[PDB]
Structure formats: C-alpha cells, structure tokens
C-alpha cells in the first residue's frame, strides 16, 4: 500500500485560498472543478521518485465555524498556512493559525509550510522578504504561488510532503 499524506489547508477566508488545492487537484489543462466528488480532494503523485497519495482538507467557506478549527486541524499530518500577498491582515493572521496547529497537534515541531498566494491583479502589500523573515522565525519553508498561472502550486505541496518525510 502506497503512503497516504493527510494535508490540511489553513488560512484567512475572503482572499481566494481555495485556488491552491483546486489548481493542484485539477489537470493543468482542465479549468474545471466539482467539489462534490471524492477525486476532488485526493491526488496520486510522485515526489523524489516515491509514489504517494495526497489527501487534502480545505474547508474554505467555513471560517465562521471558528470552534470547528481544532477538529479539522487534528485530522492533518502536515499543514499549508496560506495568506494572500495583497491582504496584510491574512498574513498577520498566520501567527495565531500556527499557534493553534501546535496546540492541536501538541507539538512545537509540526510539518508546515508558509504559502503566499497571488490570486488577482490587486497590488501586493506583503513583500516576499517579510514572508521569508516570518517563515525563517518559525523554521519553515516559504513558497509563493500564483492562482492565474499555477506557478509554485506543486512546489508548495511537494515541499510540505518533504517536510513530513524528513520529520
């Protein structure tokens, strides 16, 4: 049986975070997505020659159910903490998301990746250096992605899987 990784996407609502997982799961030339089927959150991939299954939980739209975050977070082995590069509040929210994850997993060393998402042509307000410094203060990788082009999407998820394998 191939290894299965349970990944959880966490971040502020209202800033298009769902594009990260959608872009990963959909075939690169298929601009289409039906979230109501099992294939919508599972993807078989090959990372550093080792085939695995990615199971991704992204509860985008359920941010107002704030007392369900621990429940959802506890299902994951690795976390993508996502903010929008055009929304500083989403970036400032990362710190408390990471604190919650550490509390939920009861560990100061949880496989995690910081992801900065560029999803529209609104002006950038979070510079890459600010996000690189935050990621370095936590000891985690920083990946930047685009919703328009799919650039960085795979790197974000594959980096997380490497963080889990090397834990």
């Amino acid at each position: 049986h191939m290894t299965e990784y349970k990944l959880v996407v966490v971040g502020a609502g209202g800033v298009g975070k769902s594009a990260l997982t959608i872009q990963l799961i959909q075939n690169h030339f298929v601009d289409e997505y039906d979230p109501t089927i099992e294939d919508s959150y599972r993807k078989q991939v090959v990372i550093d020659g080792e085939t695995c299954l990615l199971d991704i939980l992204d509860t985008a739209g359920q941010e107002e159910y704030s007392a369900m975050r621990d429940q959802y977070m506890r299902t994951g082995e690795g976390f993508l903490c996502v903010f929008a590069i055009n929304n500083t509040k989403s970036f400032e929210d990362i710190h408390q998301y990471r604190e919650q994850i550490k509390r939920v997993k009861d560990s100061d060393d949880v496989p995690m990746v910081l992801v900065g998402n560029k999803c529209d042509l609104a002006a950038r307000t979070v510079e890459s250096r600010q996000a690189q410094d935050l990621a370095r203060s936590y000891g985690i990788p920083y990946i930047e992605t685009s919703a328009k082009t799919r650039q960085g999407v795979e790197d974000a998820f594959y980096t997380l899987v490497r963080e889990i394998r090397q834990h």
């Binding site: 594009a19 289409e32 997505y33 109501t36 739209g61 359920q62 159910y65 007392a67």
Partner: protein
Amino acid sequence: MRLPSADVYRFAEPDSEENIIFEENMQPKAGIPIIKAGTVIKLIERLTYHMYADPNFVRTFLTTYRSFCKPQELLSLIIERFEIPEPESAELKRFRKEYIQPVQLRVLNVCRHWVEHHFYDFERDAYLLQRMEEFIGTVRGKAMKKWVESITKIIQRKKIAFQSSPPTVEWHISRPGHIETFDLLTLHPIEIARQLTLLESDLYRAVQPSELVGSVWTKEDKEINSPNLLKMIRHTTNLTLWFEKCIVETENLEERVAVVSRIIEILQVFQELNNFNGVLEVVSAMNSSPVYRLDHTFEQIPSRQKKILEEAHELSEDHYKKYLAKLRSINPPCVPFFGIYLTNILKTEEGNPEVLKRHGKELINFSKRRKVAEITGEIQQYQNQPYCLRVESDIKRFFENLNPMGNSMEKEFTDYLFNKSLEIEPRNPKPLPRFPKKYSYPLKSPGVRPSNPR
C-alpha cells in the same frame, strides 16, 4: 418559420457554436437540452423560448443570473424580448400564434417567477419595481390579462410584508418558570436537545439562496448580505464554546464526568431528531484542544456513551463520508450541517470560469451556475418540514441568550479554556490534583427516555 431580421430584433440571430453550446445530455424528465453556455441574448432567448417552457432553466437562471447580469439589465432584456416586431397572410398568422404569443407568455412567466421567488431584487431597488409595474400595465390581450392580473396580485402581497399532538415537555431539577436555576445539568437533557433543535431548525430554515449565491458570506459585505446564515453559524459556535466551558469550568473530576456524560446524552437525542448541526456542535466541543486532552475524564465515561461519541465523530471522518450517506438516507425533518454546502458553493464558484471562449467569442458559463443552483436546491429541500415539538419559551430564551465568551475576544477566551484544561488535568508527569465540588444538586441523569407516555 420566417423570423424578423437580427438588426431589428436581436433574439432572431440563429444558433451557432459562437453564441450557445450544450451539454451532451437532456433534462431527465422533460427531454430538453441542457445549456452549457451562451451569450446573454441567447440565455434570454432560451429563458423565454417559443418551442417549449423550461421551468428548470427559469428557476436556475433567476437564482444565479446576478453574477453575469444586473437586475435592471435583465428587466430591459425581457422587455426587449417581449416587444416582437412582425417580419418585413398565413405566414403572419402562424408567426403570431407560434412565436409571438408563446414568447410573450414566457416573459410573463419569468416576471411572475421573479416577483414570487426573488422579490428581494425589487425591495433593494424601488426603481426596478416601478419599471416592472409600468411594463406589466402596458400588456394588452385577453390571453395575457390572466397572467398580468396574477403578477399584480403577487406584487401587492409581497409589498404588504398542521400536525397531531407533540410530546410532553420534559423537566428535571429546574422547575417550570424557574429560569434562575436553568443550567446544563438542571434542565432535562431530552428538552435541551429538543429546544436547541427547534432553534437550530428555525435558523437553518431562515437562510435564503441570496445569502449564498456569489459566495457573498465570505466577502467584505457578508454582514449585509448573509445575516441569517451568520446568525445560524454564530449560534452553533456559541453552543460548542458553551459545552467546552461547562466541561473545563467543572474542576472536580466526578462532576466533570457527569457534565461530559450529560453532553453525550444531548448528542444521542440530537441523533434521534436528525439534528446534524447539533451533533457536530457536540463533536466539535469534544475534539477541541481543551476537551480532547482530558484523558482522566474520558476514562470514566460509560462504554456505551464512549461508543455514542465515537460513532458521532466518525460521521466527520474521510471528508464527512458517513455524514453525507446518512443525510441522503434521512427522512425530514432534519437540521443539516451547513458547512459542507458553503465549501461546495465556494469551490464551485472559485474553481470554474465565469466565461467560456468559442471561436474568440465569450459565452457565459451557465453550467457553473447550474451546479450552484443544485446545491441551493438541496439546502431548500430540508427547509420545508417542521418538527413536531412544543416550544418552551423560557428554555428557548436561555439558549438564545447564552454567551460563554462574555466580553472577551476569541483568542483570550480560547486561551482561558485551554489554561483551565491544563489546571484541571495537568500535563504529565504533573500529579492529578483534586478540586472541590461546585454542584449542590444531584448529578444523576434522568436518562434520554421520555418520563410519561405520549
């Protein structure tokens, strides 16, 4: 059949790959094609088609059009569709009977469905209603009069804004009218679940598709556009937080075991009532960071109650696989968990393009809208059947006014619950302290079986 020139009547333009595309299948019950995409002119032509009525397309269209067309623009388009010029005899008499009369009748049906099911467009724009009333007032014909008169009666009604015996209300330590003693352990667990189910069912039922289409509950104007949805979610959060508070604020182990055990009994009753919102409120509290770590509490919970909680927790596993099967097998009345619908609507809207391109022309992606209308339709199917339960006004009010956070902010309150958890059950190898009892009344539950015959 000879139609007018597209230069004088835009809807006469013939169908092509550049203005209207279909899905491979047909509407299951009507044998009608399924529109995938088209220009707004083509969508408006098919919304009021001369060959046949298309009630599914009308319903889907009027629920979702605002993402691609403004209400004011839609009115203009249907007025334009109705004003059919004759082409430049037996051919004219056929055109009047087979094109004009059916098209005109279809636009009146759209107007009727619009005012009946989406009157909020008119409440939010008084000028839109002025133009509708004016347009409807200019409609002449004995064939149209009957439909015109009905639209006027709906507008006036909208401007001026059944079972057997329910079970007996259950009481435990708190007596009827003694609201000051009302609490988790003093109210009867059956009646806590019933009154929360009545509240949660009403909150679910008040949510309209206008609060969901366009993912408006996630946008900056969510408080304006999705107030009933947000109230429903905030009550749910409130109850989860109250359950967690009840638990971690009961410092004595024996009393905390009684508290957790009573919450599992409320959960059992929510499952009996098909209140899935209620089930997940409890499961969320049990899986919270402050509660989840209380091993000394969970060790003392009776095996049957552990199994009830485990089965409820399993509904959420594997992206709600078991919850989704159980909801499909239910059996209204019920209170679904809304969060799955919210995620499905948002991902449908963000994961599919608003426009499709064919031969360099932009076509509105209608199938994306259809998928959203199918979710909103599924929400609505559970909003019609009420519960046969009696409202108890004081218990209702006690649950409506619960406020476990008080004046605290979310982080502050959440840190306080977690610090209470660490105090009552320290992290190993710290020894387990003892704490004094806080409840002066009996901890024994009356159970979840009614006290008298119905």
